[PDB]
Amino acid sequence: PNITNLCPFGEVFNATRFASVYAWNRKRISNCVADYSVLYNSASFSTFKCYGVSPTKLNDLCFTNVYADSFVIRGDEVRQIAPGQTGKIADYNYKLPDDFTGCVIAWNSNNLDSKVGGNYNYRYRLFRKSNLKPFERDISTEIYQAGSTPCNGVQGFNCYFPLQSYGFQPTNGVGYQPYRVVVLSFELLHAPATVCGPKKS
Amino acid sequence: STIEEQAKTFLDKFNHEAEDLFYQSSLASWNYNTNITEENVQNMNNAGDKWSAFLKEQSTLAQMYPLQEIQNLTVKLQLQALQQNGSSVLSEDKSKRLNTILNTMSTIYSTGKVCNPDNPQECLLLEPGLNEIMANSLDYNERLWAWESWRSEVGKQLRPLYEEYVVLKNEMARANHYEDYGDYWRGDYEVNGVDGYDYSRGQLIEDVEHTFEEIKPLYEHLHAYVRAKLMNAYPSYISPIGCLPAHLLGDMWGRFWTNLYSLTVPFGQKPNIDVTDAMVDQAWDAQRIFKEAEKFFVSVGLPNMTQGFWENSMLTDPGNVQKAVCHPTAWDLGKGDFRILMCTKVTMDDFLTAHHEMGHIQYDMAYAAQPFLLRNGANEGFHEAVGEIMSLSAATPKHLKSIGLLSPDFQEDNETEINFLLKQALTIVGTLPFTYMLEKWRWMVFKGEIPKDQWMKKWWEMKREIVGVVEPVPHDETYCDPASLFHVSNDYSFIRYYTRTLYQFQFQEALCQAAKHEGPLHKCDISNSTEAGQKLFNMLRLGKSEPWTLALENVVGAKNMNVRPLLNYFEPLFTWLKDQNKNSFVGWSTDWSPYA
Ligand SMILES: *[C@@H]1O[C@H](CO)[C@@H](O[C@@H]2O[C@H](CO)[C@@H](O[C@@H]3O[C@H](CO)[C@@H](O)[C@H](O)[C@@H]3O)[C@H](O)[C@H]2NC(C)=O)[C@H](O)[C@H]1NC(C)=O
Ligand SMILES: *[C@@H]1O[C@H](CO)[C@@H](O[C@@H]2O[C@H](CO)[C@@H](O[C@@H]3O[C@H](CO)[C@@H](O)[C@H](O)[C@@H]3O)[C@H](O)[C@H]2NC(C)=O)[C@H](O)[C@H]1NC(C)=O
Ligand SMILES: *[C@@H]1O[C@H](CO)[C@@H](O[C@@H]2O[C@H](CO)[C@@H](O)[C@H](O)[C@H]2NC(C)=O)[C@H](O)[C@H]1NC(C)=O
Ligand SMILES: *[C@@H]1O[C@H](CO)[C@@H](O)[C@H](O)[C@H]1NC(C)=O
Ligand SMILES: *[C@@H]1O[C@H](CO)[C@@H](O)[C@H](O)[C@H]1NC(C)=O
Ligand SMILES: *[C@@H]1O[C@H](CO)[C@@H](O)[C@H](O)[C@H]1NC(C)=O
Ligand SMILES: *[C@@H]1O[C@H](CO)[C@@H](O)[C@H](O)[C@H]1NC(C)=O
Numbered sequence: 001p002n003i004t005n006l007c008p009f010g011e012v013f014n015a016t017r018f019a020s021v022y023a024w025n026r027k028r029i030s031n032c033v034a035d036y037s038v039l040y041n042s043a044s045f046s047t048f049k050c051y052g053v054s055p056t057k058l059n060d061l062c063f064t065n066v067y068a069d070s071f072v073i074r075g076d077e078v079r080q081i082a083p084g085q086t087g088k089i090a091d092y093n094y095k096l097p098d099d100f101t102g103c104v105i106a107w108n109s110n111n112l113d114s115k116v117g118g119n120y121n122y123r124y125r126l127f128r129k130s131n132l133k134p135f136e137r138d139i140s141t142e143i144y145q146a147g148s149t150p151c152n153g154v155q156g157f158n159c160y161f162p163l164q165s166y167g168f169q170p171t172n173g174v175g176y177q178p179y180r181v182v183v184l185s186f187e188l189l190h191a192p193a194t195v196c197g198p199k200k201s
Numbered sequence: 202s203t204i205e206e207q208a209k210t211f212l213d214k215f216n217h218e219a220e221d222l223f224y225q226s227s228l229a230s231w232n233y234n235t236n237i238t239e240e241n242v243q244n245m246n247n248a249g250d251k252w253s254a255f256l257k258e259q260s261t262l263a264q265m266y267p268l269q270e271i272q273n274l275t276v277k278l279q280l281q282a283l284q285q286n287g288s289s290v291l292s293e294d295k296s297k298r299l300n301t302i303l304n305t306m307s308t309i310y311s312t313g314k315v316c317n318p319d320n321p322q323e324c325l326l327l328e329p330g331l332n333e334i335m336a337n338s339l340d341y342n343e344r345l346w347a348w349e350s351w352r353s354e355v356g357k358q359l360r361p362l363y364e365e366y367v368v369l370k371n372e373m374a375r376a377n378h379y380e381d382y383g384d385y386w387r388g389d390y391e392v393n394g395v396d397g398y399d400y401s402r403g404q405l406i407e408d409v410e411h412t413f414e415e416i417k418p419l420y421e422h423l424h425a426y427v428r429a430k431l432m433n434a435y436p437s438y439i440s441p442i443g444c445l446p447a448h449l450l451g452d453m454w455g456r457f458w459t460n461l462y463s464l465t466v467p468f469g470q471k472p473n474i475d476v477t478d479a480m481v482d483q484a485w486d487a488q489r490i491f492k493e494a495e496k497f498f499v500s501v502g503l504p505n506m507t508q509g510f511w512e513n514s515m516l517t518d519p520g521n522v523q524k525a526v527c528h529p530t531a532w533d534l535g536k537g538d539f540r541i542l543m544c545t546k547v548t549m550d551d552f553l554t555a556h557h558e559m560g561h562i563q564y565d566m567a568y569a570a571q572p573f574l575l576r577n578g579a580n581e582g583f584h585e586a587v588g589e590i591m592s593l594s595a596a597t598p599k600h601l602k603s604i605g606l607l608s609p610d611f612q613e614d615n616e617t618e619i620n621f622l623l624k625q626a627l628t629i630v631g632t633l634p635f636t637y638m639l640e641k642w643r644w645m646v647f648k649g650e651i652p653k654d655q656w657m658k659k660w661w662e663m664k665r666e667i668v669g670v671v672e673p674v675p676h677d678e679t680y681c682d683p684a685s686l687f688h689v690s691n692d693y694s695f696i697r698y699y700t701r702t703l704y705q706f707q708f709q710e711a712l713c714q715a716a717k718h719e720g721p722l723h724k725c726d727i728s729n730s731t732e733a734g735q736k737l738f739n740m741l742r743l744g745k746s747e748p749w750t751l752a753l754e755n756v757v758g759a760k761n762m763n764v765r766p767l768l769n770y771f772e773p774l775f776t777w778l779k780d781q782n783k784n785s786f787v788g789w790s791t792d793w794s795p796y797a
Contacts, residue, residue, distance in 0.1 A: 164218070171509070173536065176537050
């Protein structure tokens, strides 16, 4: 071969604005050469916690149609993003399958997504009728009935708004400051593989 | 669906939105107390009036759930706090009258002024001055005059206000399913959940004197020794048969006897252990003091202190026009934010206060995982006891020598040990009868056993009997002596201070027992002991989620409140006092008085 073709990880990691967890952003990646070495050696990333694939052998494997899902969550909830985990956002906002083969990266963003008056532009789902299937996205905004009476879309007794905002502040302690999370999913279907790392000469 | 599910959903909705508003109110209060400007006053007012104006609706909504069907205990316990009427049981007129009464009582107490007879234009206040006069002076006549002036130019107008206050608050309590206001105060010490750990409101009454009767001989011997020393003091005033007067104790009310230490030092020649000069000689700043205080807790085993505490907290010396009231406080602003506030100086008392406040911060940090409504101590007495344990354990000569303050080749002996024990006793054990008598009087007057006419006289003979304090000058019915107190004019419960000492000494004795220490209890130290730290943490992490009877089961092996550790701590002092005053007799006679 000769000089390679880069893959655009800049527009997914260094984006100015992310999206709330209840509407987590999804991106598809195909026909590119991905270099995970620069991601592994980076010191900024706090959590690099990926199970089914050994971290040192990403460049050797060759996949097709990689996926990247990005969002912003609280510090204490980063442990909820794992196979076979339960909580509030794990079962109501973003659920991972139990046979996951991916890789989750999480890092601190206190100086980007915080404001002295408070950043109230991040919302998450709190009430659902039932749990969520893996890799399912729900954006329905309808009043929630916790009793045995119709609500008619007005916040009465036992009728709650399903989505609730975040209260990020610059002086909050660790565990409440916003964290940015991105998960990579490696699927391998029957079509020829295209996405895998450089072949050194 | 079941009611419990609706209650759970309501609580989940409530707590998350309450957290942010509470945090905003706390931040406004911090900004005001750290930077006293006019703007901050109204900012705090307008950022905190909303918190109650939000809590009111949440309290209102938490009544359609019939709290006799909920199970799971924790949900019911959490909902119990929300289902509180407060003061809404009464109409607007009575409520506003009560609020105005509280405000005018506080204003009258906080603006006291008494002028000496010869100059009716230059008065003195309860701020240093009159307090300084009755604290560190020598004349009998001026002390008596100051006592009478303070009790006749402050508490004389408080009598009608308190008389109306008693009946108004009693009516409110009766409206709130409590026949007395004493029950309303005692409701904190009540649990009606798990079997075998239950506790009723009326049981505390029977418990208080049951645990008080065992310490009577120690108080009697201390009273006899202090009276003998005061007889070596001011002549032709004390009687070797009766009990000592009121204004010679060394304070406005006699709550503490610390100011009396100078007159009644056992040896005198032996100097107390003070390392202020040594601390200065090594160039010790506030940062060093707080780092040593943190290292103590780290060595014990408690969690390491978080970043931002070293940045946001105002540790020392505001200095310039940036004024700030700096009563030493520990702030838990919520959302994982903890701070301290103090005007640190280079002195031993600052070291002890730093240890105390750091222990407060540690306890606040321990139970952060509990829900919003359960982030407190098991009862009102645990918090200060936990804070004071570290202060007690950080003043030992061994610990001071280990941090390189005292000389390495220092040796302690009988005299200095007895001196320190007496100094600590004069502050710790000399206040229990006063608190017991005051709380008993308040409960009795709330219940209504003593009528309107039998208010002051009954107060005075119960003070003469329980405490041993006589009349300098009589008061018939026109005064209200107990009303001239901070915790009585501001509507504060007073039985906390009685339980705090017993809890702290039980905790210290248990830790020393499970710390492998040999010798007298007063020289015990819990540094470099991970098992003691683990045992303490296993109870601190509980929060309010469990009854305090269960809380007093992981530190000690008995749920009841016993008083043996106190009698164990002051054992050398007691055995010295037994052979010290072998001629004078213990006890007092209630008939003799200074004026009759
Ligand atoms: C997203 O943005 C970050 C920075 O905001 C990018 O990381 C930075 O990339 C630059 C350019 O390669 C690095 O500078 C280089 O550093 C090496 C080692 O010191 C030096 O020899 C080179 O001459 C050059 O100066 C920089 O170190 C690196 N890290 C930081 C903290 O700035 C990142 O590449 C962007 N894209 C992604 C996907 O993260
Ligand atoms: C709690 O345990 C720590 C150690 O885990 C104790 O600190 C150690 O104290 C000893 C003396 O008590 C120190 O030994 C001396 O060190 C100096 C140099 O600093 C040396 O010149 C002397 O000849 C002697 O060897 C030791 O260094 C010190 N270690 C540390 C890490 O501070 C501490 O005293 C214990 N506290 C108690 C028992 O209250
Ligand atoms: C009361 O209900 C709560 C649920 O809100 C229970 O709390 C959970 O209990 C289980 C088992 O004890 C634990 O595994 C969970 O970690 C607890 N928390 C949550 C959020 O599920 C509680 O145990 C119940 N108590 C009783 C006595 O039934
Ligand atoms: C205290 O408040 C005043 C009034 O706005 C302000 O000018 C000053 O900077 C504040 N102090 C600090 C330390 O910020
Ligand atoms: C509060 O007062 C109302 C009457 O205004 C009463 O119906 C309600 O039961 C009270 N709350 C409780 C917990 O008793
Ligand atoms: C505790 O925090 C201090 C502060 O810097 C640090 O020096 C020390 O190593 C910490 N100890 C731990 C994490 O065990
Ligand atoms: C303290 O008292 C004991 C008891 O007899 C005695 O043996 C010891 O010498 C005394 N110590 C001093 C310093 O007086």
